[PDB]
């Protein structure tokens, strides 16, 4: 839990650093935002593969065996994450935009808490550092988009900073649903990957960003 709360904390702090950077920019070209959003997606796609799905299968394979039942648990968990996020998809229009940002961060918060529930830092940290590396440009992104739709930059940062609070919260949620029983871990692993692939598939020069984020994550998986 503590390793997970500190993991979400690093995620909050990193969102803050990117949000505070918007104080100076205030506005960027569309392409640069699209670059940053391809980069952040790229991270998420690769981390839900190399940090959740493939470690979940191994987690599953030792609890239940090398057979297809272990892959069945993680894939079923993964499908339930998609349905979860699909279900969650439901000028007084700022609020509707920030719920999106809040819903985006719910998987990333759980992912951190799920990756730590067994303590294996060879799963918690590559993922957590992967999530926090991409919260800088996303924090930045959230703040600029909030400003682009009409808030003063100070409010925009403020809301963007507050938005990162979903990562400490969601890390708690993730440690919870992954600790009740031994299958919960690989299921939860598939679930967070499922949730996270959704928002990437549903939320969205950008493929330069995407490759970057995907090559970067692979680099992180090797080294951490």
Curated annotation (Swiss-Prot):
Ranges facing Extracellular side: 65-66, 118-119, 179-182
Effect of residue 105 to A: Loses metal binding at M2 but does not lead to significant changes in either overall structure or metal coordination at M1
Sites where the protein binds Zn(2+) 4: 89
Primary residence: membrane
UniProt-annotated binding residues for Zn(2+) 3: 89, 202
Result for mutant: residue 51 to A: Is more tolerant to high Zn(2+) or Cd(2+) concentrations due to a decreased metal uptake ability
Role of this protein: Selective electrodiffusional channel that mediates the uptake of Zn(2+). Exploits in vivo zinc concentration gradients (maintained by cellular zinc homeostasis) to passively move zinc ions into the cytoplasm. ZIPB-mediated zinc flux is dependent upon pH, but independent of the proton motive force. Is also able to import Cd(2+), but is not permeable to Co(2+), Cu(2+), Fe(2+), Mn(2+) and Ni(2+).
Protein name listed in UniProt: Zinc transporter ZIPB
Protein residues bound to Zn(2+) 5: 34
